[PDB]
Ligand binder design. Structure first.
Ligand SMILES: NC(=O)c1ccc[n+]([C@@H]2O[C@H](COP(=O)([O-])OP(=O)(O)OC[C@H]3O[C@@H](n4cnc5c(N)ncnc54)[C@H](OP(=O)(O)O)[C@@H]3O)[C@@H](O)[C@H]2O)c1
Ligand SMILES: NC(=O)c1ccc[n+]([C@@H]2O[C@H](COP(=O)([O-])OP(=O)(O)OC[C@H]3O[C@@H](n4cnc5c(N)ncnc54)[C@H](OP(=O)(O)O)[C@@H]3O)[C@@H](O)[C@H]2O)c1
Ligand SMILES: COc1cccc2c1C(=O)c1ccc3c(c1C2=O)C(=O)C[C@](C)(O)C3
Ligand SMILES: COc1cccc2c1C(=O)c1ccc3c(c1C2=O)C(=O)C[C@](C)(O)C3
Lengths: 254, 254
């Protein structure tokens, strides 16, 4: 119970790595805001798992990458925190949500509007969420940006996505320096290919191809990545800031 | 109690980061071999702290960087593990022992004999200790190499030390790939300036100058680094291998 009395926001925790992260932060005692855009049933299933495991959580709906997104998210976050604690304190922000489909877009096919959509959700919104979140965050808080090993491994069909993760990792670098005087750490956690429940992971042949990228010759589980995020959220990571944390299963060995 | 039933060797755990690491691994339930070169009293004090806290440990003497070093260390290690467990299994190796100066060596003054001594202790011995340790190591083991942020931050008067840490980090990269089929992870943890109990840390004016290197404007405590090492030793780090883990308090931010 390393996070008793703490409040956490995990963006995009209706499913996948964000669900696994929300579940683990709540097992540690955090009150978790389970954020989603569209899949309310999946958000409700994350919350229901947390409640059955003895924790506390509530859903927050906000489409990121559109006007009023940060405002909408913080309205629901602050109301839920205040009703459950009397306070609006935000100890932990995990920037996990993303436009992150498994379908490729090869460079010849990328459109200006896809560049805009990826960047709005994956780079701009995390920056503006950090800016708003720190108002509420005590000295000693945690900001965790979920990147990708693709910032270190060329994959042409993910160029547009990868650009936005490169921008996200700059948030880590420069905001770690900015926020250090407050004792707020800022780190990137980089997954590799990770089973998020999507249909591709139900095709054993494709999963075995995907698995070859890892030194361990398996795809990641959501919990493999979420276990690393959870450690970073704890006190014992205090001496790690501005860092790139490889949570890829040995996919970044060159 | 994340390391119940596991056996750990922390090289150079009579003092400093290694002592703090041995103490924390033992708090998690590991049986810790507390290795030292010549300060038996300091080793016996690490062991006595672990025993007062309810854990198990024993001292192992072996000078590294001399003929017969690995053999001598593993004689003492295996005897102590066999006496206490009936087995010689080694779950965790932390390559922490190293040679250094109080204030480095200007490049013009580095001698061949100094290059050899730094190499022998800080790079060669860790490789040969990994080579021997895996004979004993079950699937799912941990090898943790303690490096330095100086592999990323130019400091001329540390060129000789830093060469050896550059070599050590290559053990991490290449042995992570080699050992991945066994589920043994191999990672580097890189401290910045860290209070090891040396007399310089009793001089407040010098500590305040050293402190400016961290983004947090304090020197690291041994436990700041040891807490990161301890997490790497646990099951929840399973998806981290071949990594450079910054445990410097934001020293590479500048
Ligand atoms: N899985 C991988 O192989 C992998 C690899 C590298 C990095 N990552 C990164 O890890 C993170 C999690 O990935 P995942 O695979 O777990 O994701 P996922 O299963 O695709 O889930 C995406 C999550 O983000 C939310 N989201 C998507 N677009 C949004 C928007 N415009 N506004 C608000 N929320 C939005 C979704 O909400 P709804 O449920 O409402 O749609 C959902 O909760 C992402 O940053 C991803 O890029 C994943
Ligand atoms: N403290 C820092 O600022 C700092 C910064 C970056 C990296 N590091 C790294 O962190 C690690 C721990 O550093 P520390 O400052 O805690 O070290 P320390 O206080 O100097 O302690 C050194 C330890 O290593 C042992 N040792 C030294 N030379 C040995 C040899 N030839 N054979 C066997 N054992 C030997 C010592 O044994 P005896 O007690 O018997 O002498 C002692 O247990 C090292 O890898 C160091 O390079 C430290
Ligand atoms: C060598 O290959 C990699 C080395 C490191 C990391 C990754 C990969 C992949 O091949 C890969 C392919 C597709 C996706 C991703 C990755 C990825 O992790 C993701 O980022 C998630 C996305 C964009 O949904 C689909
Ligand atoms: C910019 O400065 C740094 C950026 C990153 C890391 C470090 C430093 C230092 O200034 C520094 C100075 C002296 C020593 C160390 C460091 C260090 O970590 C050590 O490695 C151990 C040694 C050699 O015993 C003494």
């Amino acid at each position: 119970s390393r996070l008793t009395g703490k409040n956490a926001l995990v963006t995009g925790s209706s499913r996948g790595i964000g669900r696994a992260t929300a579940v683990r932060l709540a097992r540690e005692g955090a009150l978790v805001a389970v954020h989603y855009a569209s899949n309310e049933a999946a958000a409700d299933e994350t919350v229901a798992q947390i409640e059955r495991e003895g924790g506390r959580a509530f859903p927050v709906r906000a489409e990121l990458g559109v006007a009023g997104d940060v405002h909408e998210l913080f309205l629901g976050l602050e109301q839920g925190l205040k009703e459950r604690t009397g306070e609006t304190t935000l100890d932990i922000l995990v920037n996990n949500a993303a436009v992150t489909g498994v379908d490729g877009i090869l460079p010849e096919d990328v459109t200006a509007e896809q560049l805009d959509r990826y960047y709005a959700v994956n780079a701009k919104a995390p920056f503006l969420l950090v800016q708003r979140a720190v108002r509420n965050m005590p000295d000693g808080g945690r900001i965790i940006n979920i990147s990708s090993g693709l910032t270190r491994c060329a994959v042409p069909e993910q160029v547009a996505y990868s650009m936005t993760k490169g921008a996200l990792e700059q948030i880590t670098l420069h905001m770690a320096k900015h926020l250090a005087p407050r004792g707020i750490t800022v780190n990137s956690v980089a997954p590799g290919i990770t089973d998020n429940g999507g249909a591709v992971f139900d095709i054993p042949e494709i999963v075995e191809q995907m698995a070859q990228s890892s030194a361990f010759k398996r795809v990641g589980e959501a919990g493999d990545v979420a276990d690393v995020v959870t450690f970073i959220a704890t006190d014992e990571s205090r001496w790690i800031t501005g860092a790139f944390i490889d949570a890829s299963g040995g996919t970044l060995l060159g």
